[PDB]
Amino acid sequence: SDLELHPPSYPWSHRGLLSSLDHTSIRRGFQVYKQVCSSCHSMDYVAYRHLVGVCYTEDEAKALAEEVEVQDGPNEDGEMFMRPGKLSDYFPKPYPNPEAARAANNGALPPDLSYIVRARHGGEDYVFSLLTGYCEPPTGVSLREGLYFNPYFPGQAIGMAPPIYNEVLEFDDGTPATMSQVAKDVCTFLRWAAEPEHDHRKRMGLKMLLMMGLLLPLVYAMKRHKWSVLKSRKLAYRPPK
Amino acid sequence: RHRTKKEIDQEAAVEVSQLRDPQHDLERVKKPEWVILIGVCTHLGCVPI
Amino acid sequence: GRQFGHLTRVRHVITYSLSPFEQRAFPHYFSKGIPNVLRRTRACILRVAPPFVAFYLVYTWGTQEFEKSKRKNPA
Amino acid sequence: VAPTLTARLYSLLFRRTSTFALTIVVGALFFERAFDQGADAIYEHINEGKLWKHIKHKYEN
Amino acid sequence: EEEELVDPLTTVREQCEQLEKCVKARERLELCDERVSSRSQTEEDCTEELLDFLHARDHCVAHKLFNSLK
Amino acid sequence: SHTDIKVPDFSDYRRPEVLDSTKSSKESSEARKGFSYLVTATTTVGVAY
Amino acid sequence: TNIRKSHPLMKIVNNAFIDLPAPSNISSWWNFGSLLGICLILQILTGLFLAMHYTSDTTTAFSSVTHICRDVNYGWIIRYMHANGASMFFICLYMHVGRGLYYGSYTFLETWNIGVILLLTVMATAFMGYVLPWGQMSFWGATVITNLLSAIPYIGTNLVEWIWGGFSVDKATLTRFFAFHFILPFIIMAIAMVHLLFLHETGSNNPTGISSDVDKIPFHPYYTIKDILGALLLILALMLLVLFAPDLLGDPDNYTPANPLNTPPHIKPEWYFLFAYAILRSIPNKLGGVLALAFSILILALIPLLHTSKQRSMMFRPLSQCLFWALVADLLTLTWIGGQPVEHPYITIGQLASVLYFLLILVLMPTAGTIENKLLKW
Amino acid sequence: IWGGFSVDKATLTRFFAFHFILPFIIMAIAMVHLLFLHETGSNNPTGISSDVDK
Amino acid sequence: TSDTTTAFSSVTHICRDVNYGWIIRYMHANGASMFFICLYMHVGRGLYYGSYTF
């Protein structure tokens, strides 16, 4: 309450200026989103086709969309039926009205995930330190049995239960689902959903630095060459008498 | 807002003549344990926390 | 307005110039160059620097007082 | 093969503004490709996280 | 849960939590912890000493953590 | 008297290929324009990209 | 005759960028005029492409902004170039005004006064810009700001409600702000031309503050290329910002959609208004705060009347230099304070810095000029 | 110019933006129009020069 | 509003709800026609009178 603590500096694999994302790690993080987070977290801005260029393939991405039902457009009767799932749809699912989140979790909304990393202060670090760093209430501060404890939270009265060690998973090739590990991946994926352009931008940024490093001296030399006439000009004053 | 016994007494003990807008607490409420206000600040319209 | 040939009156001043294709764009660049920047720096530090450190100090102190204030021992 | 070098460039291509332009346009074309691939490969090396993984999932289509 | 999965967090946290800066902060934690237990009508509630301990620990956590994580 | 009008030494600024009063400038002219135009050509190529 | 010199259209170009007699000694600091020129066009161009997908409706405002960054090809750079260009526009704007102040350039009354109108206009422009994404900071920024006008006696309530288009910052208010944010930069441009029109009656000032008719050079090889080299430096700064740190100067909260019930603890402007913001809240008064907020900008119109020195520039005036740098240092303090809560230290330092700002410009700087004159026996 | 295979969402918004900026450009051109017009002044019904009676 | 969802509706919103929104809307619509009547007179005037020689 009016006192707070700031997150450390975790060495994410996408922390460096010219550093890509671990695309294998965005997968597992999507997996973490899919089962765990999804039941309460809306990711209104990401779609299935968005994953294609990133992690999975055309085929795989289709299939994952097919494991849900959407509520497609009306036909002849003015209906509202159900459809397998395209690639075209997004991930808006949890529940309709924001009030339903409140009715459920209790007067609290699991804030939409699509923009989280970019909306906190501290990026993935705030979220990682939150998820991983759950602890126990010290002296004299009682809660409200729905208000769990997290040091990395404004006021420290949070409405979210710690859902990171519930070891679910399909780390395909073979990756242990420890609290730490599921958290890196979930945040690595979150970075991506908040900033999908992330990699491509750093590729352009790399090129921007190389171009500039070539262009800057050259334009400078062009300009110095033209200013030469003036820099070495010599004056003399020769009055009468 | 539901006010406790302690808060009702504290507002009634406030030196009225030193206030920017002179008003007693009892002319701002009908029942002493209930204060109803608009969540809009008179300066620039923010919401008081 | 303005133009050239209508600016002002000038007498008895010669100006020797040399073509850009006959001279170097960066003559004593590091040689005469760096000494000049140091000299330009000397000339100006006492006028630019002080105001800024006064802020630098007011900034670090200001932050310390604020953060140290939200803590408390007795009473 | 050094004094006569920039001399030839000037003689054969920079004198006329015709060739001068033609050369930078012909020079913009090749350069684009060489810089693009050359910089992609530098972005490629410092990483190895994106589509190097492709070999797995796909092919099974 | 009961016994079976080796949390790298827990592993590296031990070595971390231990160390000098945190030993001292936890000392004040416990010091202040035991004060609040020893009374009734008090309110100096130990929220601060916990965060200081956590900070020192967590900085060391980050530095040494991710290395092992695969 | 206008015959006293010197022409200040520019050796301090002259490119190396033009340092000798003993020989032509025509020889190094091509290399000299070559070098300066290469700079602007490379630049436009850069900007084009 | 030529073609450049005689053709009605080319004349204008020739007289402004080719044969224009320019002082031979203007330095970087003189580049910010062309750089503002580039920033103005950059803001218009990326601004237009964004308008081709942006929706001015509260229902889809944020979504359309999101639609741009994920779906629209290269929509993201365009969006960040816009956002960061607005900041680049303020860094250049501030260099430019400061350059004018240090160097005495303000003695060109019309040019400078037009410049003040240009400052106000891009400020009014950028404020309306930031509201468009309809983020939490957009809405609460829009709220805190407009409501200031309610301090104007007898007319203030009706005035605020008139520009709101209701009793709050709602539907009517967003669409409204779109329209004005679209038309303002064009008007700015017409004014930038009048700015340049008045500037041409005298030509440029220079570092020494001494007339340069005695040594002018054509703008035609010298300043075309120096402006070029300089725009390249503006591109570097902008691109460094957008391709590596696009949110560095941005507020992570404007990423959460507007919520007229959720007041963030935060609540601060974009950095370019932080100094004025600090001056505003330093005053324990509704009217005075906004009266002094306004005065912290409109004071630039009083500057030429407070010139007191017999020399034009500051190049030869040491005492004045110190006072100038203390103004810039005081403006760092003001922005820093403006970006901080109104609790301990911060209140009294931001209160005293506000007094200093006005003591400096209004009393200290003039007094220094008189002293300096005296030391020189003038 | 459609922003798709039909006149859709992309196409309407697009058309708004261009319909907003075009009249300003028109104005700058109307000024250049008037600039060239000024080199001679106006013509008149007879098509004969009027310098003699302006 | 430039969105297909509310484009027509916003135009309707203007004529019923926005104070004096209707005249503004019709002045716009009819002004566009007035702009073409004037445009056509202007070009024709130029043609008849030889003004195009500028």
Ligand code: HEM
């Ligand atoms: C590992 C998957 C999850 C992640 C990454 C996640 C992440 C987050 C984040 C970043 C916040 C907001 C932090 C802030 O406001 O500063 C949040 C709030 C919340 N989440 Fe989760 N969450 C996940 C799964 C869940 C689940 C399964 C539930 C259902 C128990 C849940 C219910 C909540 C609630 C109620 C809040 C609001 C807390 C409050 O503001 O009072 N979340 N979550």
Ligand code: HEM
């Ligand atoms: C849209 C904003 C502005 C634009 C496009 C603009 C453009 C320019 C240009 C192109 C120059 C000539 C080159 C230079 O010295 O930089 C200039 C000089 C000047 N401007 Fe601005 N400027 C703008 C804002 C301002 C502001 C905010 C002021 C101060 C109120 C200002 C007052 C001046 C003055 C006094 C000069 C003459 C400086 C001198 O010659 O030493 N202008 N401006």
Ligand code: HEM
């Ligand atoms: C007439 C040319 C301009 C047009 C058409 C234009 C249009 C837009 C549009 C549609 C948005 C909302 C999309 C978005 O937020 O990215 C926006 C945001 C903004 N614009 Fe402009 N604008 C123009 C010139 C300016 C100018 C002159 C400035 C002042 C430097 C400016 C500063 C801003 C700012 C600060 C934002 C909000 C921050 C952000 O990018 O999210 N723009 N503009």
Ligand SMILES: COC1=C(OC)C(=O)C(C/C=C(/C)CCC=C(C)C)=C(C)C1=O
């Ligand atoms: C809510 O956050 C805030 C902003 O961001 C939206 C601002 O922009 C400003 C200052 C803005 C302006 C236009 C001051 C200039 C006034 C005049 C009369 C020139 C303040 C104070 C602020 O609190």
Ligand SMILES: COC1=C(OC)C(=O)C(C/C=C(\C)CCC=C(C)C)=C(C)C1=O
């Ligand atoms: C001699 O002093 C001057 C310069 O050297 C410091 C300039 O660089 C410029 C550059 C101005 C440009 C390119 C016009 C931009 C304006 C708009 C509206 C796009 C001008 C006018 C000038 O007088």
Ligand code: FES
């Ligand atoms: S204190 Fe200014 S709006 Fe509340």
